[PDB]
């Protein structure tokens, strides 16, 4: 195909990184610009986690010919163009989440937290239910060390503060069914959740676990691919199968349904985030399509930008 194996936004959605069959690439989201491209003749990278706009990337090998064994996490130093820390595991790595002081690795059955040091030390292990999608969010903010992940019970989210791990975790019975997506706002004060039914998105307070807002995307089932907050957490964007994107208002009693939505014309699955304009939403699709949409108060969407980001 096009060789894309992974796409993910950074902590503020200002960039997205792509794992490729032949390496990785980093891009500025808005305006779209290729920022870094590292080619590996020897194989692909199946997961890329940025730390904001620092020179550190977490890489996991993947694809038909992975650059690294899939049971290893590689921290890439993009200023030095080399791997500087490696952590090896007994099982495949499903995702990595970075903060400045912690490496969090996500495995199928557990979440291991390490020091971000030349010899990483394991600090914590949290058991999860079967987590093949690697669902985990970690607050990148210095004043909020929140780690959130699927609990051992179906539809529960366990929340742990990594600065006060002696405290019991908050367990949120978020859905009756298997979790499909989890998202934090930039402040780490709100968590958005969906089940495999994908009819409802629920936003909780991360400190109390209380439901703040329930948003109904529809009556029919949908595979939810992505959820993201805007910068002030007043809005969320929601991607679904067939590439539709729904736009809702969070934390507003005047919201329950989508004020806006658009379909991605190619229908390919996409992740979404908000642009630099408060009324901009960006969609990055598995086929390589980039879309920027502007919405209005009537919920009409206009296309501002379209590109194939993989050709730059």
């Amino acid at each position: 195909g096009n060789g894309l194996l992974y796409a993910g936004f950074n902590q503020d959605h200002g960039c997205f990184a792509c794992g490729m069959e032949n390496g990785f690439r980093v891009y500025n989201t808005d305006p779209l610009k290729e920022k870094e491209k590292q080619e590996f003749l020897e194989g692909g990278v199946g997961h890329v986690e940025m730390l904001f706009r620092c020179n550190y990337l977490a890489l996991v090998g993947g694809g038909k010919k992975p650059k690294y064994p899939p049971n290893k996490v590689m921290i890439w130093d993009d200023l030095k163009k080399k791997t500087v820390i490696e952590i090896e595991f007994s099982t495949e790595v499903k995702a990595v989440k970075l903060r400045r002081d912690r490496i969090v690795v996500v495995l199928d059955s557990m979440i291991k937290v390490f020091t971000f040091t030349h010899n990483p030390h394991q600090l914590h292990v949290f058991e999860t239910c079967y987590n093949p999608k690697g669902l985990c969010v970690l607050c990148p903010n210095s004043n909020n060390s929140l780690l959130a992940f699927p609990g051992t019970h179906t539809g529960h989210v366990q929340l742990v503060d990594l600065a006060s791990t002696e405290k019991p975790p908050v367990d949120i019975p978020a859905h009756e069914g298997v979790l499909s997506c989890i998202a934090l706002n930039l402040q780490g004060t709100r968590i958005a959740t969906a089940s495999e039914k994908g009819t409802l998105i629920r936003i909780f307070d991360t400190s109390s676990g209380h439901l703040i807002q329930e948003l109904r995307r529809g009556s029919q089932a949908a595979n939810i691919y992505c959820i993201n907050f805007n910068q002030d957490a007043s809005l969320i964007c929601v991607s679904s199968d067939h590439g539709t994107v729904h736009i809702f208002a969070a934390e507003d009693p005047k919201s329950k349904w989508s004020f806006s939505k658009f379909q991605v014309p190619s229908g390919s699955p996409c992740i979404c985030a908000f642009g630099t304009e408060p009324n901009a939403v960006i969609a990055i699709c598995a086929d390589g399509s980039y879309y920027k949409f502007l919405f209005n108060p009537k919920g009409e969407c206009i296309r501002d930008v379209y590109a194939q980001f993989l050709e730059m």
Partner: protein, 52 residues
């Protein structure tokens, strides 16, 4: 030129990143050793208090 100041800054950032990594390594190393000693203290403490 004004580009030369970019080059100097990039070197400073690269060097600072190494020093942060080294310091956090020494800090986390010592934090673990302190916890190991916090254990052996309480261990020997309760162990021979019962001796008394």
């Amino acid at each position: 030129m004004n580009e030369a100041k970019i080059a100097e800054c990039l070197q400073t950032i690269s060097d600072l990143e190494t020093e942060c990594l080294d310091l956090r390594t020494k800090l986390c190393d010592l934090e673990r050793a302190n916890q190991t000693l916090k254990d052996e203290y309480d261990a020997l403490q309760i162990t021979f208090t019962a001796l008394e």
